[PDB]
Each structure stands twice: as C-alpha cells, then as structure tokens.
Design a protein around this ligand. Sequence first.
Ligand SMILES: *C(=N)[C@H](C[C@@H]1CCNC1=O)NC(=O)[C@@H]1[C@@H]2[C@H](CN1C(=O)[C@@H](NC(=O)C(F)(F)F)C(C)(C)C)C2(C)C
Ligand SMILES: *C(=N)[C@H](C[C@@H]1CCNC1=O)NC(=O)[C@@H]1[C@@H]2[C@H](CN1C(=O)[C@@H](NC(=O)C(F)(F)F)C(C)(C)C)C2(C)C
Lengths: 305, 305
Amino acid sequence: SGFRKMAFPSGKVEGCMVQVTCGTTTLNGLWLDDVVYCPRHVICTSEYMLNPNYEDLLIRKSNHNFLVQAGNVQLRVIGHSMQNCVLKLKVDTANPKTPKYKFVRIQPGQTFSVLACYNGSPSGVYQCAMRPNFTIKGSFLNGSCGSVGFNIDYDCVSFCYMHHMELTGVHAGTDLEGNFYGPFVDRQTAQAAGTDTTITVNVLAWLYAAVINGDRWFLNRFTTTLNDFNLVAMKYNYEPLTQDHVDILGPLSAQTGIAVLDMCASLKELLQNGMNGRTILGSALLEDEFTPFDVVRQCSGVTFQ
Amino acid sequence: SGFRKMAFPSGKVEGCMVQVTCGTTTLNGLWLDDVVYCPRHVICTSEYMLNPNYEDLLIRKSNHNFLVQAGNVQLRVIGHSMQNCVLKLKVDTANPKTPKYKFVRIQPGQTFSVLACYNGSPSGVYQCAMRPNFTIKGSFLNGSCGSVGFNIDYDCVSFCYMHHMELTGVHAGTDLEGNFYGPFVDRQTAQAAGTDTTITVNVLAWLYAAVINGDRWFLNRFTTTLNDFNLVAMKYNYEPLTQDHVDILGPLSAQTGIAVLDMCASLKELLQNGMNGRTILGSALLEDEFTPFDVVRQCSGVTFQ
Ligand SMILES: *C(=N)[C@H](C[C@@H]1CCNC1=O)NC(=O)[C@@H]1[C@@H]2[C@H](CN1C(=O)[C@@H](NC(=O)C(F)(F)F)C(C)(C)C)C2(C)C
Ligand SMILES: *C(=N)[C@H](C[C@@H]1CCNC1=O)NC(=O)[C@@H]1[C@@H]2[C@H](CN1C(=O)[C@@H](NC(=O)C(F)(F)F)C(C)(C)C)C2(C)C
C-alpha cells in the first residue's frame, strides 16, 4: 500500500542522451540509431534569438559546425536536416544502446516521465501531466533544452515530449516530430499560456486510489447524473466528464465497489464545501496528475523490462 | 524554474536488480560483483512466518535451494551466508554492470530515491525521506521486498535502504549491512511505528525554494530567536532547530538575502494561523521531504554520470 508520484525507470533513456554544441550554445540531444534529435534553436545566436529565419541559419552551417558528444566519445556528424522545430543530425555511429522505441503524440491529461538533463548528463526524473492548455508544470533550468518525456510499454519506450522553452513559470515543447504542443513558437514573442483547467477524470482516479488505501471520509450515499455533475464542474473550472471517462474508470469502480456516478457525488460535495481541514492521501488539495492507468499500475503492480 | 519531487536517474541501479526464489517465495535481490544481497526472510515458509529461527532455517538449506535469475540468465549460487537481516548469496559470475558504489546508513530527515521492483524487474522510481520515527512513507505491493533506496554522488551510488516489510500503511527496512532502521524485527509481532514529527530544517528549505520560485506572500518583517522558535515548534510536533541546521541553510539564505531566523518568523506565523486558503509551490500543506541539499540541487542544476 501507499501512493507516490511515481516515474518510470529511466535507464533505457539515459543511454540515449548526448550533448550537442553549435557555436556558443550547448544543449541536450536524443541519439537513436544514427540520428541525434535536438531543438532547432541550437543554431540560434543572440542576434536572431527574437525573429530568426531557421531555413537561412541552417543553410549557412556545415556538418563540422555541430559538436556532438556521447559522454566523452565524439560523434561525427555526416548530415543534417530540419523537421519542423527539431534538428535531425545524422552521425557516423549507430547508438548501440538504442531501445525499442516509438514516437507518440500525447493528449491533455495524459502523464509521462521527464528525464531532466544538462550537458548531455541525466540530472533527475519526475512525473508530470500535459495540462489542458498544452503546457507542463516542470522543473527546468538553463541548459535543459532537449530533455525528453517518455512512457514505457512493456519493453518499448514511447517518446512524447522534447523540452524547448519556459513561458512564465511553465514549460512548452514539441513531440519528437518537431510539432509544438499548443499554440507556441520557438522564438521570443509575446506568447502566454491560456487558462488552465482541472483534469476531472484524473481527480476521480485519485479518489479511487484513496479508497483503495483506506481514506474513506469523503464518501457519501448520494449519487448524481452526468449532466448535474458537469453543471457543477463548469463553475469550478473542471473539465466536463464524458461517458468515455466513466468507462475508463470501470476497473477502479469494480475493485472498490463504488459506482463512478456515486464517486462524482462525493467530488461534487468536495467542490462545494472544501476539505474542511482534512487531507486525502497526504494532500489538502484535489490532485489531478494521476491517470486511471497510473492508479491501476501503482495499486496492482505492473513492471517492465 | 519550477519545483518537483525529483528522483535520481535509476539506470545504474536497474542493472543490479535480480530475482531470488527460494521455495515458493520470490523477491528481489541486489547483485554487486559476485554477491547477491536480499532479505533473509526469503528462507521463511508460512509455518515460520511468525517466530522463525533464521540460523536453523539457513543450515537446512544448500546452494541449490536458491534460484537466482538476472532477467532470463540464471546465476549459479556457490555459497551463502547471513549478515544480520540480509542474506548474502555468492554466485559464479561478477555482475559486469556493477557501478562504483558504497553502503551508507542515512539519518532521519535525509532523502533518497527508491527503485520499486517486482520479480527482479524495475517498476517505478520515487523520492522519499527517512522519517524521524525510522519508517518511510513508500508505495510497495506484495513482492516488493529487496527493492533498494539510493543516492548518487557524482558517479558513485550510495545504497542506503533495502525494503523488508509494511507496518500499518508505512514501510520499514534495513541498511545494506542488514541492520534495521528503527526498533523493528523481521517477523510477525505486535510492532508499530512510534509518533512521527515534522522535519523542520526541511520545511525551511522548502520555503526558500518557494521564494526562489516567486512565492513570497508568507514573508514578513519580524524575526525571532532560536529559543522562541523552538518553543512554538514543540507545540506543533516540529523537530527543534539547531545551530547546525541554520548553518546548513546558509547557501539558501545567501541566494535569497533572507536570514534563516527571518524565515523562522514566517514559519512561526504559518504554524499559528495556517495558510488561510493560500498555497505554496502548489501545496496547501507545509512540505518536509526536501533537504536543503535537494533544493540547491534542483534550483542550481547539478548533474551526474
Ligand atoms: C533551453 N536550453 C532553455 C531552457 C529554458 C529557460 C529556463 N527554463 C527553461 O525551460 N530555453 C530557452 O533558452 C528558450 C529558447 C530561447 C528563449 N527561451 C526561453 O525559454 C525564454 N522564454 C521565452 O522565449 C518566452 F518568454 F517567450 F516564453 C526564457 C525567457 C529564457 C525563459 C528560445 C529559442 C525560445
Ligand atoms: C515483501 N515481499 C513484502 C512486501 C510488504 C507487504 C506489502 N507491502 C510491503 O511492503 N513483505 C512481507 O511479506 C513482510 C515479511 C513477512 C510479513 N511482512 C509484512 O510486510 C507484513 N507486515 C508485518 O509483518 C507486520 F504487520 F507485523 F508489520 C504484512 C501484514 C503482509 C504487511 C515478514 C517476514 C515481516
């Protein structure tokens, strides 16, 4: 028993991190087979940090302008190209530590692990959710660009995020094909994140985790309808709940014998009256960065290798 | 910027996890050079799960009773011995993935990462603190025994924890020499954790992290004395603050220009009046599982390789 913000083991990804230097800019890259992936703004110098034309900047470079290091070994760049906002650097050596992988684009509300890196070197791992406004609430310092987000399925690493920029306290990036999450661009403009909402299906999953772990004080006997719940969710900046979400919560409903709509009636009460000085799983706020699948995984015990 | 419960990258430890089966009991072991370390209660069968004599149980075993698997490869046991509460299994092959390591015993209030494993297979990584009552608030299911806790110093893995048992919602274990943290034994008796307290130096470190990240609302102009603070800390089940703690907080005081005793005056107010519906770094409770060193590491950017 117990419940923790749990990240995926990072070993399979640590073996792919490299350092990429171009000019006076150093950041992180992802080395899979004979391609190094990294943010394209590594080719930016401070004259262009505000309104760059990346096609122009790339044509003025040659392979020898790119310093790529895997620890201490140097990798020789034999070709470069741009795919949207990422740079793909072809190198002379296929990474022997390349895991089975795929590139997936995730949806708001889904969670992943982040391997924060500096100078090609892994620094720490943490779990986070893609927010409904397409930012993540990460922890990133200067030089963290190119750090990646990932999930693990059995033996397969799904890469879903590469870090590009911080926007007033929160973080924005692309999928691994170089397409940004959200309406952001990789230059200095007046862009801000839009209004964030609370991920309702995740809050419900977390309440089920609490019941599984013995926190029952917030339950009640009343139920409610999808439409009467969503009426109250809207007033509190909670995402509306769909039939798809109810079905997703099925396994947790089955394991605890509490109906989804029953649990929604508890959530309704918590939103109207607050916690009144009680905590749930050691939190005094309603937590929305665990998916139904995170809860099953942690309250059932799925491993990977 | 940002602040997350961040764990160490786990790659160096994932390579040491093996599965150990004896009888119908399977759990995890740690394979370093040609020794596999695992909890000694793997030699327990349900007749002895309550009052075992481990010396007797061990003498009735031979090397062939121990099934050790590193993924799919089998390791041949060529010797066994007991050190306090751990079993040391000598095997015929030195682990080629053995990192530079040491065995350290940590103190209450210190943090470490836990690699939760099942059947020798890594499942997830999370960060936690050793509580003042010598338990940890972990997340562990059946079969997690032998999972280890660790820190990383530059290139060196310090192993500090091996998981043995759950006691009413919290978790207890040994250092890697087999000596239990706290007054617990590896059998079924009527043992419970003692009263827990809040780790004050860690709360102060977390308040400095908040200031570094722009949360300033709780500051005030008043200061206080060590003895007047500790007078109020006692009433709230907070650990007393020493001059050693003040010195440890020096770097954070320097970086924010707020004196430790100044920050204590803010903590004093928060304890007497509560948060009054405000949050700090996304929490509505005072967080005590970040050390001063965790905060520096995350708000300065130290890596490892
Ligand atoms: C990559 N190495 C850094 C890491 C950033 C900064 C601290 N934490 C992070 O996540 N990223 C950058 O330097 C990117 C890069 C130019 C500027 N930039 C920023 O992150 C800046 N933000 C913005 O561009 C803004 F404000 F418009 F959102 C900064 C002010 C330094 C936070 C480019 C090409 C966007
Ligand atoms: C190791 N594989 C498990 C993992 C435990 C149980 C679920 N979460 C964990 O951390 N550990 C055990 O099976 C140990 C082992 C016998 C019983 N035990 C327990 O954890 C039990 N607790 C106690 O002994 C108690 F209550 F006294 F504290 C259990 C009731 C199953 C939680 C031995 C040798 C202590």
